[PDB]
Ligand binder design. Sequence first.
Ligand code: NAG
Ligand code: NAG
Ligand code: CA
Ligand code: CA
Ligand code: CA
Ligand code: CA
Ligand code: CA
Ligand code: CL
Ligand code: CL
Lengths: 264, 265
Amino acid sequence: LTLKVVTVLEEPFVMVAENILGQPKRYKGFSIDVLDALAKALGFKYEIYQAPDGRYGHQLHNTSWNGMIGELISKRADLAISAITITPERESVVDFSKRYMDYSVGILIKKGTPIRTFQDLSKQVEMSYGTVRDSAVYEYFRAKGTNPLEQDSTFAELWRTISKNGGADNCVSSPSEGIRKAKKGNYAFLWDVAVVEYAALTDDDCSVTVIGNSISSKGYGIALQHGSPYRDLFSQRILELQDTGDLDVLKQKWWPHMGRCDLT
Amino acid sequence: LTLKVVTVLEEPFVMVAENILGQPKRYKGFSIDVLDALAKALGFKYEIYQAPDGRYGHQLHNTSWNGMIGELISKRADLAISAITITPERESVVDFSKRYMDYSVGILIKKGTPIRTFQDLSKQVEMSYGTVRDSAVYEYFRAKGTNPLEQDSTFAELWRTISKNGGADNCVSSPSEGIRKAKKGNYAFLWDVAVVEYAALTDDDCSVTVIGNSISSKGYGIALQHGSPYRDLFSQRILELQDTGDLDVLKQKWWPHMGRCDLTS
Ligand SMILES: *[C@@H]1O[C@H](CO)[C@@H](O)[C@H](O)[C@H]1NC(C)=O
Ligand SMILES: *[C@@H]1O[C@H](CO)[C@@H](O)[C@H](O)[C@H]1NC(C)=O
Ligand SMILES: [Ca+2]
Ligand SMILES: [Ca+2]
Ligand SMILES: [Ca+2]
Ligand SMILES: [Ca+2]
Ligand SMILES: [Ca+2]
Ligand SMILES: [Cl-]
Ligand SMILES: [Cl-]
């Protein structure tokens, strides 16, 4: 049995191995390791191709999806894996396995600052902070920072800074821009903990650290075609992998407990 | 439409509401609120009864299950809810929805100590610590503390203290004993962060704090009969609750940000 897998490059979830003349195009990463574990246990081969538009997927005007989600709906892909978050809108058109990792928003900041939490960040006027404009993270802080029922007034303060001038002043256009500004100092970037954590661990100067403190708001999962019988099987193995600690071993392979940069 | 819901008391997930004058025994809690949200969204009624043995359920020697899991397998209950963690052993015989809350192991300890992380606790010779004897948390530390591949030596150190004399020296019979010993002092209790955090928030003397910082090892979910058509429906609305922020509001209702004991040393 062979399955078609659609993916999008996202360090360290899915990465292209260094090109070597006379060798094929290989993929590596934490998500590839999870897929290999499922492939070995469930006994299936797979072929990986990247989404032609390189997008996770969002709904279009005519109720059609692009990106990896579109591939699953069109049945051009049996499953999709990268850094896909399990969201209600996606789960209504595809079927996600139970998460194999948590998702949360962290703060990428230069080392040595007195800021250690979101509350500390919200009380700062010296250091600007923000996220990627017109992203789910930006909308996440719109909801939290405008919800009357939120007890913690930190989000309201954060939203005022993030949304200044429609977000133009304090937000960036892509995660790479946010990471760059954070390393220069005088700016704190709010994005996926996993992405920023890997960015800080691989920093050439080890000049940046990551603030967690956020319980998971979503989880990364494997997306499969609607009604796919593999969804329950994938979830069972994923739970077993988490239970035995093997998934923790894979995480530390790409997010080492002690690596190049010390984040303390 | 009505569904049979099996549960077990677990503060603050499921709790008995103060009832008077022979009025029906009503339940309250974070898990009850999630159930009510699903009931309104999916348009079903329900009746809650407690597990006759008051147990979450585990496999017996003859492969039969007791507790809430047994009620689902025997189909005396349509779904089970309380503080049930989504585990592979249970998921093989029942069907869990996607988690509606994260689960992790925290530390309940008296305030005013230098201990602020698991690593700090592992380096202590003065203060004993442990978890519930013959518990999933006890097995969790057995695996981490004996796995050669774990990069953090903290877990190996913790296991030696937790498992001393087979755990007889430093473990406790129940969470209530663990909470009581932690409040006494000279003991740190390792258990569900949600349970101990509510224990610290409701402490009469506000004498204890909780050390979290642990990413979720599992998640709390709703258990349904194998092949139940409601499982996917529950997962969908559970996801929608989280996205709209309604789950966070309910959590703050039972784990308030302020108002209760301050958990800072
Ligand atoms: C819907 O929009 C997409 C654009 O991605 C287009 O490819 C597709 O042909 C459109 N129409 C229909 C009928 O699917
Ligand atoms: C297994 O043993 C238990 C005794 O605790 C009993 O109640 C149950 O009925 C047994 N199961 C079967 C299938 O006989
Ligand atoms: Ca679905
Ligand atoms: Ca991480
Ligand atoms: Ca429990
Ligand atoms: Ca199952
Ligand atoms: Ca080693
Ligand atoms: Cl699921
Ligand atoms: Cl998890």
